[PDB]
Design a protein around this ligand. Structure first.
Ligand SMILES: NC(=O)C1=CN([C@@H]2O[C@H](COP(=O)(O)OP(=O)(O)OC[C@@H]3O[C@H](n4cnc5c(N)ncnc54)[C@H](O)[C@@H]3O)[C@@H](O)[C@H]2O)C=CC1
Ligand SMILES: NC(=O)C1=CN([C@@H]2O[C@H](COP(=O)(O)OP(=O)(O)OC[C@H]3O[C@@H](n4cnc5c(N)ncnc54)[C@H](O)[C@@H]3O)[C@@H](O)[C@H]2O)C=CC1
Ligand SMILES: NC(=O)C1=CN([C@@H]2O[C@H](COP(=O)(O)OP(=O)(O)OC[C@H]3O[C@@H](n4cnc5c(N)ncnc54)[C@H](O)[C@@H]3O)[C@@H](O)[C@H]2O)C=CC1
Ligand SMILES: O=P(O)(O)/C=C/[C@@H](O)[C@@H](O)[C@H](O)CCO
Ligand SMILES: O=P(O)(O)/C=C/[C@@H](O)[C@@H](O)[C@H](O)CCO
Ligand SMILES: [Mn+2]
Ligand SMILES: [Mn+2]
Lengths: 525, 525, 516
């Protein structure tokens, strides 16, 4: 087993709880008309409390359980949990969670006697739940069991699917909420496991509040049937179209709940699942690009004090773009044109073949570089131009299956008329990439539910009571394309910066300062 | 000077005319229900007559003279004609016609004493007009002179544009026909050199027959002002939308001419230019993808006996695709997915940014592989599947200017589950590629106008009188995406096969048989 | 599916086909003034094709246990026995995709509408099918072909398992291992050798005895399976070129003498070729080494045996000649062509050594020189007649048999412009090489049943240059420079099959449409 023991007086343990002192420093800046930056440092002391008693089993309810991601996730959990080795043309392979930052990445704890960097597993600093301990279920408008789902998805090695056949076959998605207008028309035939059916047994968008009540009961039922204490809900179903946000409809906690009861046409299935999970006090993670978290819902989460988070998985082309575009601008290079083409032949691409669904994705896959452009007015300004041409294209090409092909070109300006042209061709099993990210989101969300804190008054000992994270868990931004933010704050998409936040967080809970990379043990005599 | 002298009794010269005997062989095939192919060879003897008196100057009237292709063509002609060397970062460069199959490709005439292949310039077999002898003019809805056109286009080296400044500045496009509905709305501001203006001086699609009469007079005027004997019209203006072909409108020579007089809404500017050139007996070449040659026009060409030809320039991505896809299928490999993405930032891409214009291009850029799939039912059939997923994408990205970036992926099947994935990134100055192809089309069209023939009756000497090529010059298919064909016949897009046709044609006029590649001087003792 | 041409150029005489053919061409000379004098030439011929093809064709592969050898056997068994297999994309049916003789078609003529009619490449004249191949061969490693398959990691696991029972039965015969002719690492792999001394050790002494043993292996294979026709093909690791010296291997008599003299320039492939020639069986060299030294070519001529080869024209080199040719035919001037490649199979491992790779760097390069030379408008002393070119092959084990090829064509356009085409080609190398081997065997067998006479029948000059479509280093007749234009190379084959059934070469003139 891997564990870390930090010798610090900032940390004490009391009844399965770790208490850690932390002085958070930042700075408020102002810019003079002239052009001077006045920086006022700041400080706020805290005491973080970490419940060390992690759950032995964590309930996981996926919406879209029968899809590529859904079936692959269950498969990865079963395969790893039971060490289901499988045959391939490269020979027997041992199951693993490669692609999981939470399960397969490491972090620098410090330097050793010789002065060489020492790294430890990301999940070895503080107690985290293992995906091998996930008890998974969920919903799907299609009733195929999970073995059929695997076959249909064509993601996993034939031999592996066969070894998981027996178990996967017994896993059946619960009927779900199907409202025809929110997803592509071509998914119509797929919908045969719906709870919203009229007297004639047909699909009906009538009775949206009864649906909400069923989903909540589904969560309660699942939990007790498994003797679980905690459950997390994650949406990994078809990308819906955006819903119109309007006053009196979904702008407030009150208008939203009412619109739901009135069956407003701008209440999507995700709106119902989110509202249900929130009302049950269950973390809800949105893995798709639609704007499920309209003002009224966020408001409901804040009021209920329930974790919400998400907006599309940042797994391939966009993940790398949030690394490459950052890199270029940090180097003083000016990207002026970024073309991103994509084609896949799975159900994800089949649904996204329709404009209303594609537009959702198109928006989240573009937003990722906006903050980058904004951070540098030396390169991007009115005099030199502050725009970067950016196009996102997603075409459905059945023959490539789940292996999305991403082709991008970054055309940038260098000094004295020069240019830099970086062409990319990125191929990979989209689900094998996404699945571990879904695992990361659940692992980190669960970790977050066991964290609380309280401001420390310098001139008054033991003031304030512990609070929980502000409802919107921005700490999970690393795994999302369009980071949901707190009202007023702008999102930051820099991948490396998003991971650093997670790193320093774990580091501070065990009493370590943030990474500085100064290495004065070397640079100074 | 380069010239070829073939010792053959099949060729005689009489008063600046070459007379050549040729026995054309082919074969008619039938397929038995059982599955046998009955092949009946055929033969038809001919006597081809080639007018050797090529014109000293060839009139060239481009529609879209002020565009990227138009200005570049005039520039290339001026630069080469006057040996205008220019400065670059790689040093002084000498003008040339690289990219011109007609000016820079060679053909194998035979083998030498040692048995080694001997090649001669494509234009050295028989007298052809030099582009240095082109007298160019034309029309454009924009009045900018050709120097401004060059600056605006940003295709040529700054130093070269400057050396051509004086001459190019004096070249001004003639006002043209602007009908707002046929091209992108964004070209509206560009239109300020129109002949179709009402009393108020505004653009009017009224009086389409007067426009036709003006264009014809334009051709007559241009010709006499330059003391020219021959002129060729070539459309290199914005891609128009397709026009609806309907009975009583543009299905016959008669309905078309009437619709023109009635100002039918399905009579585009290209329809007018084509009709005008045909009525003037001037070859008309369509360098864009719109369906300018509706049944009624082709009928008018046949009746007038005037050369027509075209439908989009096959210059880059599509040219290479007509080589690569052919190659794969000839090798028994089965392409199943071909994704073609493209982005450019010139006016061509700005206009194509609108769906109605893009659809025209999209159709011609796809058609190129249909004949290939059809030729092999071993690979493409009902049992194995006879479809090849193919998508064409064109995005406008201003920062790349005239340097179109073409990205394609050919995903094919190999035996026993294998696949082959060929990714491509093709960059180039689109106009530097297209321009020489426009030059080729004009050079070959002019050559064709000096060719006639007559069937030879074996049992009756001197029967029949000379005829000219069937109106639709399919021999130019090498330079076009969607080869216009004779009613009933299907087009062949194989690039290498298209060039071979041109090669064997020139070869037969000087008394040589088609290339067989048997080399029995080597393979046999 | 069959073809029946109504022509008076072909007469059948009991499994015999006689076809008349006038071969036209032309001889050219150039005047100082720059005038080309062309004199047409014609030579009449009569071809005879023995229509009686073998019902079973013996195939002996040197390197039978490698990627190509094992995949070849698997494809034959899989197709022959319709072994469908499971994949994550579902059940797939076996086929010979990638094979020109089995999966490409040819245009026979036009229909009543004026549109092209195509027929299977192997449907014009009787050709042996790969399903009727009886395969055996040698290998320095004794692993059975099932183990060979697993080792190769070329085929779908389920297909390997469905073929396990049959493939296990196939084991390679011991072979000749002369250490110095290949990459060191191919050492402890050599556990199956006939060349051993009275101590049991691998030796290069007694080369004539080795030769005699290969002939016996060939005779036994024939008798053992009651086969009349057998073809041998080298698909074993690339050897290091041998030096051709006078009296050593410059002639038929010297060559044989040097073999008996255990001469150091007598390579294992040299012996398999000599043995095959003596047994009268066609020998195909699927590797870059210069197996066919002068003395060896004389032996082939003398025995009237067909030889052919010098490296299996791989996909890249194949597509590279096509693109380069295409550019130059369009009047575009490539000025730089860079080729980088990496694979992780034994082939790549063996080529990781300079002497093995060097052989391959010689063949794949010469192809663009033909192109440069074909156009003095673009390539001349005034504008420059050179084209920078580089071929790099690195061993990257992890990519296994899936060779990755990365090329970049940089060309000049008019008035200072440029065209940059960069490619990234990936594929299971052996899934492309296997079918190419099937084509070579099928076409070599066909050529052996063809004889001709100008105007007693004679045979196809030892070197079957007709197979250049599948070989990177086209072996040619003395004095003649090899041609590599893939499309031209396929044209030759197409027209050959056409002339045998009385059809002229394709002209693409389509006068039924172009003329009134
Ligand atoms: N596989 C491909 O795509 C291409 C292969 N080639 C040629 O074919 C050869 C084989 O290719 P692969 O099957 O991929 O390689 P491989 O490495 O799997 O096959 C060679 C292995 O070495 C053994 N071997 C070495 N020396 C031998 C000898 N003296 N007698 C008998 N067996 C011997 C066997 O041939 C064994 O299978 C290469 O070395 C090369 O010359 C050429 C172009 C492409
Ligand atoms: N696949 C990837 O790598 C990534 C996936 N995502 C997103 O995750 C989602 C799922 O992706 P995949 O698994 O590939 O797609 P998928 O189409 O295979 O799976 C989605 C599943 O959701 C079900 N479904 C649709 N609407 C539903 C509803 N209202 N209630 C319950 N079930 C419903 C469908 O029947 C289907 O089985 C999509 O929105 C996709 O864009 C985002 C980034 C990356
Ligand atoms: N540029 C290339 O490499 C190739 C070009 N083509 C086609 O050739 C055409 C021209 O291309 P570019 O020169 O790049 O575009 P461009 O936009 O620069 O030039 C076209 C010119 O035509 C003029 N024009 C538009 N409608 C007109 C009308 N009714 N009458 C007269 N003038 C009119 C415009 O004012 C403009 O100056 C387009 O349809 C393009 O798609 C096709 C294949 C390749
Ligand atoms: O590879 P990315 O840009 O990080 C993620 C991309 C995802 O949106 C895609 O897989 C999407 O679901 C399919 C269409 O491309
Ligand atoms: O490069 P291609 O496919 O041969 C020709 C492509 C031409 O249609 C393009 O330049 C088109 O005008 C612009 C949009 O791509
Ligand atoms: Mn997926
Ligand atoms: Mn252009």
């Amino acid at each position: 087993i891997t564990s870390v023991k930090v010798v610090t007086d900032k940390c004490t343990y009391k009844d399965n709880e770790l208490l850690t002192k932390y002085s958070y420093e930042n700075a408020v800046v102002t810019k003079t008309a002239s052009g001077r930056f006045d920086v006022t440092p700041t400080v706020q002391d805290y005491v973080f409390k970490l419940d060390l008693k992690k759950p032995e089993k964590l309930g996981i309810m996926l919406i879209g359980l029968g899809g590529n991601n859904g079936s692959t996730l269950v498969a990865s959990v079963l395969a790893n949990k039971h060490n289901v080795e499988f045959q391939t043309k490269e020979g027997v392979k041992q199951p693993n969670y490669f692609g999981s930052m939470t399960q397969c990445s490491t972090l620098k704890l410090g330097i050793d006697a010789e002065g060489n960097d020492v790294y430890a597993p990301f999940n070895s600093l503080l107690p985290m739940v293992s995906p091998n301990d996930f008890v998974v279920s969920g919903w799907d408008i299609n009733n195929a069991d999970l073995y059929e789902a695997m076959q249909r998805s064509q993601v996993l090695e034939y031999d592996l699917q066969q070894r998981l056949k027996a178990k996967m076959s017994l896993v059946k998605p619960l009927p779900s909420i199907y409202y025809p207008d929110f997803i592509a028309a071509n998914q119509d035939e797929r919908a045969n496991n719906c709870i919203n059916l009229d007297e004639k047994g047909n699909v009906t968008t009538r009775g949206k509040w009864t649906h909400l009540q069923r989903i909540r009961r589904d969560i309660q039922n699942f939990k007790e049937e498994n003797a679980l204490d905690k459950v997390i809900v994650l949406w990994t179903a078809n990308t819906e179209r955006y819903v119109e946000v309007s006053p009196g409809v979904n702008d407030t906690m009150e208008n939203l709940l009412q619109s739901i009861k009135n069956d407003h046409e701008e209440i999507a299935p995700s709106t119902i699942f989110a509202a249900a999970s929130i009302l049950e006090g269950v973390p809800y993670i949105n893995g798709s690009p639609q704007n499920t978290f309209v003002p009224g819902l966020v408001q409901l989460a804040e009021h209920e004090g329930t974790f919400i988070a998400g907006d599309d998985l940042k797994s391939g082309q966009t993940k790398l773009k949030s690394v490459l575009a950052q890199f270029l601008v940090d180097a003083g290079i000016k990207p002026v044109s970024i073309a991103s083409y994509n084609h896949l032949g799975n159900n994800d691409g089949y649904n996204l073949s329709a404009p209303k669904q594609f537009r959702s994705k198109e928006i989240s896959k573009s937003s990722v570089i906006d903050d980058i452009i904004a951070s540098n007015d030396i390169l991007y300004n009115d005099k030199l131009g502050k725009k970067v041409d950016h196009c996102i294209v997603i075409k459905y090409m059945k023959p490539v299956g789940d292996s999305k092909v991403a082709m991008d070109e970054y055309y940038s300006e260098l000094m004295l008329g020069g240019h830099n042209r970086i062409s990319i061709h990125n191929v990979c099993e989209d689900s094998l990439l996404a699945t571990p990210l879904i695992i990361d989101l659940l692992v980190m969300t669960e970790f977050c539910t066991r964290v609380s804190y309280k401001k420390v008054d310098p001139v008054k000992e033991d003031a304030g009571k512990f609070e929980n994270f502000y409802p919107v868990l921005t700490f999970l931004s690393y795994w999302l394309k369009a980071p949901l933010t707190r009202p007023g704050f702008h999102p930051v998409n820099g991948l490396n910066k998003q991971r650093t936040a997670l790193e320093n967080f774990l580091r501070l809970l065990i009493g370590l300062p943030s990474q500085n990379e100064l290495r004065f043990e070397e640079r100074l005599l």
